[PDB]
Amino acid sequence: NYEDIAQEFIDFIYKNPTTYHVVSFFAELLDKHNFKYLSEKSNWQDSIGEDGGKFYTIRNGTNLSAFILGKNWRAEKGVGVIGSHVDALTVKLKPVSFKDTAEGYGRIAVAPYGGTLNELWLDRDLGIGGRLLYKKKGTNEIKSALVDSTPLPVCRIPSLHFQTIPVINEPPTDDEKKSPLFGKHCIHLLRYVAKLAGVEVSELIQMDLDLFDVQKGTIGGIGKHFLFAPRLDDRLCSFAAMIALICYAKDVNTEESDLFSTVTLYDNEEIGSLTRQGAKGGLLESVVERSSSAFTKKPVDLHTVWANSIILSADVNHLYNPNFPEVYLKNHFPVPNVGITLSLDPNGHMATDVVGTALVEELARRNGDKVQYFQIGTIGPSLASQTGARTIDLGIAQLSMHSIRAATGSKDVGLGVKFFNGFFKHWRSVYDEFGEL
Amino acid sequence: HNYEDIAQEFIDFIYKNPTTYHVVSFFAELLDKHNFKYLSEKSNWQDSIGEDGGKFYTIRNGTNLSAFILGKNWRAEKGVGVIGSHVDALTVKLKPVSFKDTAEGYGRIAVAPYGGTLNELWLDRDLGIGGRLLYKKKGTNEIKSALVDSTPLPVCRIPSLAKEDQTIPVEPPTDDEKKSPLFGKHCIHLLRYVAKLAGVEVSELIQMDLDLFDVQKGTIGGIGKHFLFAPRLDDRLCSFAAMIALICYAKDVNTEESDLFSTVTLYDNEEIGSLTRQGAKGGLLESVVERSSSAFTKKPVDLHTVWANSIILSADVNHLYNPNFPEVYLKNHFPVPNVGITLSLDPNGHMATDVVGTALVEELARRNGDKVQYFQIGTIGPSLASQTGARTIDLGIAQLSMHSIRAATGSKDVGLGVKFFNGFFKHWRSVYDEFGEL
Amino acid sequence: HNYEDIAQEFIDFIYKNPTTYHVVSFFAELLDKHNFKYLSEKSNWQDSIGEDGGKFYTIRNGTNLSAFILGKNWRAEKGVGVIGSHVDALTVKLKPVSFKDTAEGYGRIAVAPYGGTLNELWLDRDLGIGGRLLYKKKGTNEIKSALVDSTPLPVCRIPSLAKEDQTIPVEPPTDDEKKSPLFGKHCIHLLRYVAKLAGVEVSELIQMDLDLFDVQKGTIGGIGKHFLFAPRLDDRLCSFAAMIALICYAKDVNTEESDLFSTVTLYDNEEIGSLTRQGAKGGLLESVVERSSSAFTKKPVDLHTVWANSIILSADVNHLYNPNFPEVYLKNHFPVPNVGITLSLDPNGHMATDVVGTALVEELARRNGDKVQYFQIGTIGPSLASQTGARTIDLGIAQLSMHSIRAATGSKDVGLGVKFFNGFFKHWRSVYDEFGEL
């Protein structure tokens, strides 16, 4: 059902404001569906057998790779990849967020992540949330907790007839003063997040906190054709790709299968992808190399793996704005509630690659999907040249990406899930038709 | 004390009453369940108001409301205690012909800004549709009014690009539907939709005055819950505070033991300069007072003496100190949240050269335990002051980001506003007596 | 039907009555030959208006005229049916001292634009001189008024080059002529010329208020004769239509069998912002109504109830679709010629938030077989609405090139205007009754 899945998506965005939450939500979901967690810091020889299986691993709490490795898989089968990003534009709390009292008001020093933060972030109810690092008293292990003020908006960037943030008891306790963070954040804030995590202010080691729009998404429009929500870029494609993987994995037994499938979710795409958790940090390549090495003791030719692989770089494109027709190109703009959109740039990486377009075109035909085009995304070029594998830039189109609240079709989440599910099922048999090309 | 929310009651009020029509209708229901009697402005009031006086309210246009308490023992020399405020807010309005043909399958509507050339603040906000429909049921010759509201459904939005640019993303016509007077003017789907909400047929729709407004419900906000975020605060915040103050005050008033004449009058079209018949310059306040005093006693009433003895609080919002822009504000002349009512002073403007009104408000607050704040930099105060000859004081509850689609103010400010206004109705006459001839 | 000219009658009217003085005087003659009785505004009307009511008109300044029909059975609850319009037009005026010494033999006069900073459209047009002279005949102590008009003689023109640039290319003084109060102020030739037209001596001239205006007679135009080209259409077009409508309506009215109060009031100084005693804000309409209702019955009349039940058509011209400039116009909100009256709607402005007036005009047209057009983008409507408290609708007959020295409109538009306005006087009361409390 398209209505139900759109509501699931709204819920997901509402309940998982920060990248940390998103990766933790998918971690939980994968666990429920019998994917086995693999620590990056351990060797995978002893975790992965000839049987293959369903696994996932996490880097930095923000970079997730989930994969299904078939028992009968071999290098010439390649890998079926969906790559996407889970970072969104936000305001981040500065390492020292402490602000002097300004005529009675309390404020916090913050910085924009992923851009300059425009006028659309003014007068929005902003919650606070993210990752605390803490060390319980009498121990020497540092741990992670996620906190989230929702539904409480702790602050707002006020607009001004004529970019810091108004947040606002008891003086600081001797215990509280022992905290590493005691100098660097106002004591009220430290108490608030300490309270949310269920730990003492003295035990707080560090913070990575976002300010985010706390307004829940809605189905909208007079015929309910639209969906308005925060953080659509690109948790929309990430969500749809992951649900597609889990639905696909439902009807898969790794002992029968000869396929290698993965959905890898990256951080730092809004920052240009050149970090360890970004597309350029190699988690995908690492997963496939590690897995293939642990899987069999026959040495695997990775060049043959990637030469037979298809990577879908799933990043959102621009839905047609009927009020700025001049911006768009006739016959190369998508509309809502039709299907996935193919990104085509004459000066981008697919400019001299007609095979990927045709493959996707062929997939949609078999699966009963429609494909739209867009002609005037770091992940695609990065992955394509890092692996040597054929890569297609795809996406679910949305209105006003990099708004604090974007819009897309109410059916587009479901249509995205359908298409990506179709990809995992048919890509190999479709790619076979092109042979050596 | 624990009852300074009241902020929730206010939040629910803004949420449930998005247009001026809804706000006036809401106050009408509140007043008459507090035993205020509705008087038609289209009928003479001689036989509706008697020696005993009473509690009354009248309405002009469904957007301009006056509520008053007239004492049995009132006389010209007592004057009137007036709070004047406005209930119109900045919105987008559906144009008289809102019809746009499809843009690549997208449905759209022609709309116009009301009260400004609207902000980027209106972009990417969930917008409901609502307001007044006029209709005539079949085989009738009465034109009736229905109120309509899509909340919580946002039927549209003005998209940013990642009346040309600011436009809006939103089976065949029945013979009966083509018989509607609005058939060519608005797309059949919208007409079918509003007809459904009102509980009437499309063919019965005569006219409509619909707004587009933010359907995001207000919230208490801040880490210590010091703030209130909500749409349409200007000037539904003062209007609410003044009306609730009057109704709380009215509770302890038997009109038979009263010598006071009290009113809260709520105007339309302040954002447009007030020069309409529903605005401050349309004179509903003066009309109410002349009519009441005429109907109430057989003796002739000198209205000049009434106004010379009156005090009008012209209640409209001031600007909270925005700590992000210290330079626009004047030191020792800017309000902070959760403290109290703010007095608008302006060296040019109608309250320059009138130190008495300022002194009176200070004395009131002193007596009632309130705090007063200052703010030096077609407003209704100057209009009302000059129209009546009565001493008028500009003040209000201060807020941030005024004329934004979502503004901010103290979480205690609704309650403090009600407190101050309640004190005003109780004490103004007594306090103004010691200024004597001044 | 063949009698939609009427356009000729209008053309002859503009041609023969170039100044505001002439227009008011022309209407005075038309009214009193239709048995309307002149009332001096300087005398009390108690003994001039009786139980029977009647047909009347009064004049302020020779430029502000009100004509009214008061029914024998009229009462406050019936209200007034009002059409309000303006009769001043853009012109050049002779300055109080118009005297210029010769420029290489050329005779010239100091003049000022009235109602604008005037166009290149005024260049190379034949300009007559005319207006009001004040004079005192010899051995008298009465100051009388004479109207003066040079048509068809163009006495001057503002030349283009193939108050510095816009100036105008136009024997010894008798002892008696030097005795005139205007001797130093205007050149002897001009004074001799206007004195001749009035039939008085130069020595008898006290003062003058003279215009310069286009003497080119209007024409029906277009290959199918769809248009009317003429000077001074704004707003002598609506004024003419409204007055003729009233007089046609008055024909079938015995005031003894009437319960209606009807008026067409014509104002001066709309081009100047209306804040003069002869303008809309000078309150002639309200004065007429208060006086009439006072004189007419011994019972006291509640004026608030009168206005609450009234409808004012504020008749002023809108803009025809100029096919040369499509971008300035808003789609589905622009009038075309020869269709019918145009409703002025404006999202900001006094008719925003009043859907009832629009609905009433639509219902009227429906009943009378008229068509209504829309136009969304010191006007008198807002002034009158706020001054009375009465529901006011802005509308009018649309034209091209408004504030040009020669404008255009439909050749059928005078007749359609008269038709609509005649229907209004016949049906407004009945149609407004079904809105009831609204």
Swiss-Prot record, chains B, C:
<keyword id="KW-0865">Zymogen</keyword>
<keyword id="KW-0378">Hydrolase</keyword>
<keyword id="KW-0813">Transport</keyword>
<feature type="binding site">
    <location>
        <position position="316"/>
    </location>
    <ligand>
        <name>Zn(2+) 1</name>
    </ligand>
</feature>
<keyword id="KW-0862">Zinc</keyword>
<feature type="binding site">
    <location>
        <position position="270"/>
    </location>
    <ligand>
        <name>Zn(2+) 1</name>
    </ligand>
</feature>
<dbReference type="GO" id="GO:0032258">
    <property type="term" value="P:cytoplasm to vacuole targeting by the Cvt pathway"/>
</dbReference>
<dbReference type="GO" id="GO:0070006">
    <property type="term" value="F:metalloaminopeptidase activity"/>
</dbReference>
<feature type="binding site">
    <location>
        <position position="86"/>
    </location>
    <ligand>
        <name>Zn(2+) 1</name>
    </ligand>
</feature>
<comment type="function">
    <text>Resident vacuolar enzyme that catalyzes the removal of amino acids from the N-terminus of peptides and proteins. Also acts as the major cargo protein of the cytoplasm-to-vacuole targeting (Cvt) pathway. The precursor form of aminopeptidase 1 (prApe1) assembles into dodecamers and the propeptide mediates the aggregation of dodecamers into higher multimers. The multimers are then recognized via the propeptide by their receptor ATG19, and ATG19 further interacts with ATG11, which tethers the APE1-ATG19 complex to the pre-autophagosomal structure (PAS).</text>
</comment>
<keyword id="KW-0482">Metalloprotease</keyword>
<protein>
    <recommendedName>
        <fullName>Vacuolar aminopeptidase 1</fullName>
        <ecNumber>3.4.11.22</ecNumber>
    </recommendedName>
</protein>
<dbReference type="InterPro" id="IPR001948">
    <property type="entry name" value="Peptidase_M18"/>
</dbReference>
<keyword id="KW-0325">Glycoprotein</keyword>
<feature type="binding site">
    <location>
        <position position="316"/>
    </location>
    <ligand>
        <name>substrate</name>
    </ligand>
</feature>
<feature type="modified residue" description="Phosphoserine">
    <location>
        <position position="287"/>
    </location>
</feature>
<keyword id="KW-0926">Vacuole</keyword>
<keyword id="KW-0597">Phosphoprotein</keyword>
<feature type="glycosylation site" description="N-linked (GlcNAc...) asparagine">
    <location>
        <position position="64"/>
    </location>
</feature>
<dbReference type="GO" id="GO:0000324">
    <property type="term" value="C:fungal-type vacuole"/>
</dbReference>
<comment type="similarity">
    <text>Belongs to the peptidase M18 family.</text>
</comment>
<dbReference type="GO" id="GO:0005737">
    <property type="term" value="C:cytoplasm"/>
</dbReference>
<feature type="binding site">
    <location>
        <position position="319"/>
    </location>
    <ligand>
        <name>substrate</name>
    </ligand>
</feature>
<keyword id="KW-0479">Metal-binding</keyword>
<feature type="binding site">
    <location>
        <position position="270"/>
    </location>
    <ligand>
        <name>Zn(2+) 2</name>
    </ligand>
</feature>
<feature type="binding site">
    <location>
        <position position="270"/>
    </location>
    <ligand>
        <name>substrate</name>
    </ligand>
</feature>
<feature type="binding site">
    <location>
        <position position="403"/>
    </location>
    <ligand>
        <name>Zn(2+) 2</name>
    </ligand>
</feature>
<comment type="subunit">
    <text>Homododecamer. The precursor form of aminopeptidase 1 (prApe1) assembles into dodecamers and further aggregates into higher multimers (the Ape1 complex) in the cytoplasm. The Ape1 complex is disaggregated in the vacuolar lumen, but mature aminopeptidase 1 (mApe1) retains its dodecameric form. Dodecamer assembly in the cytoplasm is essential for formation of an enzymatically active complex. If cytoplasmic homododecamerization of prApe1 is disturbed in mutants, homododecamers of mApe1 will form in the vacuole, but they are enzymatically inactive. Interacts with ATG19.</text>
</comment>
<keyword id="KW-0645">Protease</keyword>
<dbReference type="GO" id="GO:0042802">
    <property type="term" value="F:identical protein binding"/>
</dbReference>
<feature type="binding site">
    <location>
        <position position="234"/>
    </location>
    <ligand>
        <name>Zn(2+) 2</name>
    </ligand>
</feature>
<dbReference type="Pfam" id="PF02127">
    <property type="entry name" value="Peptidase_M18"/>
</dbReference>
<feature type="glycosylation site" description="N-linked (GlcNAc...) asparagine">
    <location>
        <position position="61"/>
    </location>
</feature>
<feature type="binding site">
    <location>
        <position position="271"/>
    </location>
    <ligand>
        <name>Zn(2+) 2</name>
    </ligand>
</feature>
<feature type="binding site">
    <location>
        <position position="234"/>
    </location>
    <ligand>
        <name>Zn(2+) 1</name>
    </ligand>
</feature>
<dbReference type="GO" id="GO:0008270">
    <property type="term" value="F:zinc ion binding"/>
</dbReference>
<keyword id="KW-0653">Protein transport</keyword>
<keyword id="KW-0031">Aminopeptidase</keyword>
<dbReference type="GO" id="GO:0034270">
    <property type="term" value="C:Cvt complex"/>
</dbReference>
<dbReference type="GO" id="GO:0006508">
    <property type="term" value="P:proteolysis"/>
</dbReference>
<dbReference type="InterPro" id="IPR023358">
    <property type="entry name" value="Peptidase_M18_dom2"/>
</dbReference>
<feature type="binding site">
    <location>
        <position position="271"/>
    </location>
    <ligand>
        <name>Zn(2+) 1</name>
    </ligand>
</feature>
